[PDB]
Short mmCIF file of all heavy atoms in Angstrom, two decimals:
data_model
loop_
_atom_site.label_atom_id
_atom_site.label_comp_id
_atom_site.label_asym_id
_atom_site.label_seq_id
_atom_site.Cartn_x
_atom_site.Cartn_y
_atom_site.Cartn_z
N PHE A 32 10.49 -7.53 -4.37
CA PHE A 32 9.94 -6.41 -3.65
C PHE A 32 10.62 -5.13 -4.09
O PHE A 32 9.96 -4.16 -4.46
CB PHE A 32 10.14 -6.67 -2.18
CG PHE A 32 9.62 -5.62 -1.32
CD1 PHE A 32 8.31 -5.65 -0.96
CD2 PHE A 32 10.38 -4.59 -0.89
CE1 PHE A 32 7.79 -4.70 -0.16
CE2 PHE A 32 9.86 -3.65 -0.08
CZ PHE A 32 8.55 -3.70 0.28
N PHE A 33 11.94 -5.14 -4.09
CA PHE A 33 12.67 -4.01 -4.62
C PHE A 33 12.25 -3.70 -6.04
O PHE A 33 12.20 -2.53 -6.44
CB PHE A 33 14.15 -4.31 -4.60
CG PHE A 33 14.68 -4.49 -3.24
CD1 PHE A 33 15.74 -5.33 -3.00
CD2 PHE A 33 14.15 -3.79 -2.20
CE1 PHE A 33 16.23 -5.48 -1.73
CE2 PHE A 33 14.64 -3.95 -0.93
CZ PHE A 33 15.68 -4.78 -0.70
N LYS A 34 11.97 -4.72 -6.82
CA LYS A 34 11.53 -4.44 -8.17
C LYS A 34 10.15 -3.81 -8.12
O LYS A 34 9.96 -2.67 -8.56
CB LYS A 34 11.54 -5.70 -9.00
CG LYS A 34 11.40 -5.41 -10.47
CD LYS A 34 10.53 -6.43 -11.10
CE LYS A 34 11.15 -6.98 -12.35
NZ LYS A 34 10.39 -8.15 -12.82
N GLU A 35 9.18 -4.52 -7.53
CA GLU A 35 7.80 -4.04 -7.52
C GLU A 35 7.71 -2.63 -6.95
O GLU A 35 7.35 -1.69 -7.67
CB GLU A 35 6.92 -5.02 -6.74
CG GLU A 35 5.42 -4.93 -7.09
CD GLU A 35 4.51 -5.36 -5.94
OE1 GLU A 35 4.84 -5.09 -4.77
OE2 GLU A 35 3.45 -5.98 -6.22
N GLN A 36 8.11 -2.44 -5.68
CA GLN A 36 8.10 -1.13 -5.05
C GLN A 36 8.68 -0.04 -5.92
O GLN A 36 8.45 1.14 -5.68
CB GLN A 36 8.89 -1.16 -3.75
CG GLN A 36 8.20 -1.91 -2.71
CD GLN A 36 6.87 -1.34 -2.43
OE1 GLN A 36 6.75 -0.27 -1.85
NE2 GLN A 36 5.84 -2.05 -2.85
N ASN A 37 9.60 -0.44 -6.80
CA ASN A 37 10.15 0.43 -7.84
C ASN A 37 9.25 0.80 -9.02
O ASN A 37 9.20 1.95 -9.43
CB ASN A 37 11.45 -0.15 -8.38
CG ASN A 37 12.36 0.91 -8.96
OD1 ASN A 37 12.79 0.82 -10.10
ND2 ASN A 37 12.66 1.92 -8.16
N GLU A 38 8.55 -0.19 -9.56
CA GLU A 38 7.63 0.04 -10.66
C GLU A 38 6.50 0.91 -10.18
O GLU A 38 6.05 1.81 -10.87
CB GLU A 38 7.08 -1.28 -11.18
CG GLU A 38 8.04 -2.44 -11.06
CD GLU A 38 7.79 -3.51 -12.10
OE1 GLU A 38 6.86 -4.31 -11.92
OE2 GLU A 38 8.52 -3.55 -13.10
N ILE A 39 6.07 0.65 -8.96
CA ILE A 39 4.98 1.38 -8.36
C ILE A 39 5.41 2.83 -8.31
O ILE A 39 4.62 3.73 -8.57
CB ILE A 39 4.71 0.87 -6.95
CG1 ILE A 39 4.14 -0.54 -6.99
CG2 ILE A 39 3.77 1.80 -6.21
CD1 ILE A 39 3.56 -0.99 -5.68
N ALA A 40 6.68 3.04 -8.00
CA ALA A 40 7.25 4.37 -7.93
C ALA A 40 7.16 5.01 -9.30
O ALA A 40 7.07 6.22 -9.44
CB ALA A 40 8.69 4.28 -7.49
N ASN A 41 7.22 4.15 -10.31
CA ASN A 41 7.27 4.56 -11.70
C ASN A 41 5.90 4.60 -12.35
O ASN A 41 5.80 4.68 -13.56
CB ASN A 41 8.18 3.63 -12.50
CG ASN A 41 9.64 3.79 -12.11
OD1 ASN A 41 10.02 4.76 -11.47
ND2 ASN A 41 10.45 2.83 -12.50
N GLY A 42 4.85 4.53 -11.54
CA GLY A 42 3.51 4.64 -12.06
C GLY A 42 2.81 3.38 -12.50
O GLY A 42 1.84 3.43 -13.25
N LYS A 43 3.29 2.23 -12.06
CA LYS A 43 2.67 0.99 -12.44
C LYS A 43 1.21 1.03 -12.01
O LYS A 43 0.90 1.40 -10.90
CB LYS A 43 3.39 -0.16 -11.74
CG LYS A 43 2.60 -1.44 -11.65
CD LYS A 43 3.34 -2.45 -10.81
CE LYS A 43 3.23 -3.84 -11.39
NZ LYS A 43 3.29 -4.86 -10.32
N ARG A 44 0.34 0.63 -12.93
CA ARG A 44 -1.11 0.75 -12.80
C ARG A 44 -1.72 -0.21 -11.80
O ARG A 44 -1.18 -1.28 -11.55
CB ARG A 44 -1.76 0.53 -14.16
CG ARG A 44 -2.53 1.72 -14.72
CD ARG A 44 -3.38 1.30 -15.91
NE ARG A 44 -4.29 2.37 -16.34
CZ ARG A 44 -5.57 2.43 -16.00
NH1 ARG A 44 -6.11 1.50 -15.23
NH2 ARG A 44 -6.32 3.44 -16.43
N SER A 45 -2.87 0.16 -11.25
CA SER A 45 -3.61 -0.78 -10.44
C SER A 45 -4.45 -1.62 -11.37
O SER A 45 -4.72 -1.22 -12.50
CB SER A 45 -4.50 -0.05 -9.45
OG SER A 45 -4.73 -0.86 -8.31
N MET A 46 -4.86 -2.79 -10.91
CA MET A 46 -5.76 -3.62 -11.68
C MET A 46 -7.04 -2.84 -11.87
O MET A 46 -7.67 -2.94 -12.93
CB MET A 46 -5.99 -4.93 -10.95
CG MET A 46 -5.88 -6.17 -11.84
SD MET A 46 -4.82 -5.86 -13.47
CE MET A 46 -6.29 -5.44 -14.70
N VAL A 47 -7.42 -2.08 -10.86
CA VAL A 47 -8.69 -1.37 -10.83
C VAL A 47 -8.82 -0.40 -11.98
O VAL A 47 -7.88 0.31 -12.31
CB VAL A 47 -8.77 -0.52 -9.55
CG1 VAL A 47 -10.07 0.26 -9.50
CG2 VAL A 47 -8.60 -1.38 -8.32
N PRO A 48 -10.08 -0.38 -12.61
CA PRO A 48 -10.20 0.66 -13.64
C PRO A 48 -10.20 2.04 -13.03
O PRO A 48 -10.63 2.21 -11.90
CB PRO A 48 -11.54 0.38 -14.28
CG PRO A 48 -12.36 -0.13 -13.18
CD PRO A 48 -11.43 -1.13 -12.60
N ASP A 49 -9.71 3.01 -13.77
CA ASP A 49 -9.51 4.36 -13.27
C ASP A 49 -10.77 5.08 -12.85
O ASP A 49 -10.75 5.91 -11.94
CB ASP A 49 -8.70 5.20 -14.26
CG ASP A 49 -7.23 5.27 -13.89
OD1 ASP A 49 -6.87 6.04 -12.98
OD2 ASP A 49 -6.43 4.55 -14.52
N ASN A 50 -11.87 4.77 -13.52
CA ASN A 50 -13.13 5.46 -13.29
C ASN A 50 -13.95 4.99 -12.10
O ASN A 50 -14.92 5.61 -11.73
CB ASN A 50 -13.97 5.45 -14.57
CG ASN A 50 -13.53 6.51 -15.55
OD1 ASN A 50 -13.59 7.69 -15.25
ND2 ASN A 50 -13.08 6.09 -16.71
N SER A 51 -13.54 3.88 -11.49
CA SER A 51 -14.24 3.36 -10.33
C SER A 51 -14.03 4.23 -9.11
O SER A 51 -13.04 4.92 -9.01
CB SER A 51 -13.79 1.94 -10.03
OG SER A 51 -12.58 1.96 -9.32
N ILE A 52 -14.96 4.18 -8.17
CA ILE A 52 -14.96 5.09 -7.04
C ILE A 52 -15.05 4.32 -5.72
O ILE A 52 -16.03 4.41 -5.00
CB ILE A 52 -16.15 6.04 -7.14
CG1 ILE A 52 -16.09 6.86 -8.42
CG2 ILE A 52 -16.22 6.94 -5.92
CD1 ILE A 52 -17.44 7.39 -8.85
N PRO A 53 -13.91 3.56 -5.41
CA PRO A 53 -14.05 2.78 -4.17
C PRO A 53 -14.17 3.63 -2.92
O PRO A 53 -13.57 4.68 -2.85
CB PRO A 53 -12.76 1.96 -4.11
CG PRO A 53 -11.76 2.80 -4.78
CD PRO A 53 -12.51 3.23 -5.98
N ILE A 54 -14.97 3.18 -1.96
CA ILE A 54 -15.08 3.80 -0.65
C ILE A 54 -15.01 2.74 0.43
O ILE A 54 -15.68 1.74 0.34
CB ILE A 54 -16.43 4.51 -0.51
CG1 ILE A 54 -16.73 5.29 -1.78
CG2 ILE A 54 -16.45 5.40 0.71
CD1 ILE A 54 -17.97 6.14 -1.67
N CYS A 55 -14.23 2.95 1.48
CA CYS A 55 -14.16 1.96 2.54
C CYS A 55 -14.86 2.45 3.76
O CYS A 55 -14.53 3.48 4.32
CB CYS A 55 -12.71 1.62 2.89
SG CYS A 55 -12.54 0.68 4.41
N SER A 56 -15.85 1.68 4.19
CA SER A 56 -16.64 2.01 5.34
C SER A 56 -17.36 0.76 5.74
O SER A 56 -17.30 -0.24 5.04
CB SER A 56 -17.65 3.09 5.00
OG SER A 56 -18.66 2.57 4.16
N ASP A 57 -18.02 0.80 6.88
CA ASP A 57 -19.02 -0.19 7.18
C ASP A 57 -20.33 0.55 7.06
O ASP A 57 -20.46 1.66 7.55
CB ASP A 57 -18.86 -0.75 8.58
CG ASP A 57 -19.29 -2.18 8.66
OD1 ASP A 57 -20.40 -2.48 8.19
OD2 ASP A 57 -18.50 -3.00 9.17
N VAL A 58 -21.31 -0.09 6.43
CA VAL A 58 -22.56 0.56 6.13
C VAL A 58 -23.23 1.00 7.41
O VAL A 58 -23.83 2.06 7.48
CB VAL A 58 -23.51 -0.38 5.40
CG1 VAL A 58 -22.89 -0.85 4.11
CG2 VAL A 58 -23.84 -1.56 6.29
N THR A 59 -23.12 0.18 8.44
CA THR A 59 -23.78 0.50 9.69
C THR A 59 -23.21 1.83 10.14
O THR A 59 -23.94 2.73 10.53
CB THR A 59 -23.43 -0.56 10.73
OG1 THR A 59 -22.07 -0.41 11.14
CG2 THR A 59 -23.59 -1.93 10.12
N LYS A 60 -21.90 1.94 10.06
CA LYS A 60 -21.20 3.18 10.37
C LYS A 60 -21.56 4.28 9.39
O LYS A 60 -21.63 5.45 9.77
CB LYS A 60 -19.69 2.96 10.39
N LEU A 61 -21.74 3.92 8.13
CA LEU A 61 -21.88 4.90 7.06
C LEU A 61 -23.09 5.80 7.21
O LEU A 61 -24.17 5.35 7.57
CB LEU A 61 -21.95 4.19 5.71
CG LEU A 61 -21.54 4.94 4.45
CD1 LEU A 61 -21.42 6.44 4.70
CD2 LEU A 61 -20.23 4.39 3.91
N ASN A 62 -22.90 7.07 6.90
CA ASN A 62 -23.98 8.02 6.78
C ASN A 62 -24.13 8.16 5.28
O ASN A 62 -23.18 8.49 4.58
CB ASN A 62 -23.59 9.35 7.47
CG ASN A 62 -24.17 10.58 6.78
OD1 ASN A 62 -23.52 11.62 6.69
ND2 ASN A 62 -25.38 10.46 6.27
N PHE A 63 -25.33 7.90 4.79
CA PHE A 63 -25.54 7.86 3.36
C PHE A 63 -25.88 9.24 2.84
O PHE A 63 -26.01 9.45 1.65
CB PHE A 63 -26.62 6.84 3.02
CG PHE A 63 -26.27 5.45 3.46
CD1 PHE A 63 -26.13 5.15 4.79
CD2 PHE A 63 -26.06 4.45 2.53
CE1 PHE A 63 -25.80 3.87 5.20
CE2 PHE A 63 -25.74 3.18 2.93
CZ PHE A 63 -25.60 2.89 4.26
N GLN A 64 -26.03 10.18 3.76
CA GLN A 64 -26.31 11.56 3.39
C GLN A 64 -25.15 12.11 2.59
O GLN A 64 -25.33 12.81 1.60
CB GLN A 64 -26.53 12.41 4.64
CG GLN A 64 -27.88 13.12 4.69
CD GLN A 64 -28.34 13.55 3.32
OE1 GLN A 64 -27.53 13.80 2.43
NE2 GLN A 64 -29.65 13.63 3.13
#
């Protein structure tokens, strides 16, 4: 944990590609406007 939390501090990348645009919502809640 001390190691990981450290690398993260140092810019360790997410698995996720950089160009993706995640959004967290529930669609029912979501206004698509």
Side-chain angles (χ1 to χ4, degrees), residues 32-59 61-64:
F32 181 85
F33 296 149
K34 193 219 229 170
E35 202 208 36
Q36 289 302 288
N37 206 234
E38 328 207 281
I39 291 193
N41 292 344
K43 160 187 220 210
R44 242 192 171 261
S45 207
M46 226 22 265
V47 179
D49 262 282
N50 280 298
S51 81
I52 300 157
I54 316 187
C55 167
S56 70
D57 212 310
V58 300
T59 72
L61 204 346
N62 146 218
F63 300 64
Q64 237 325 332

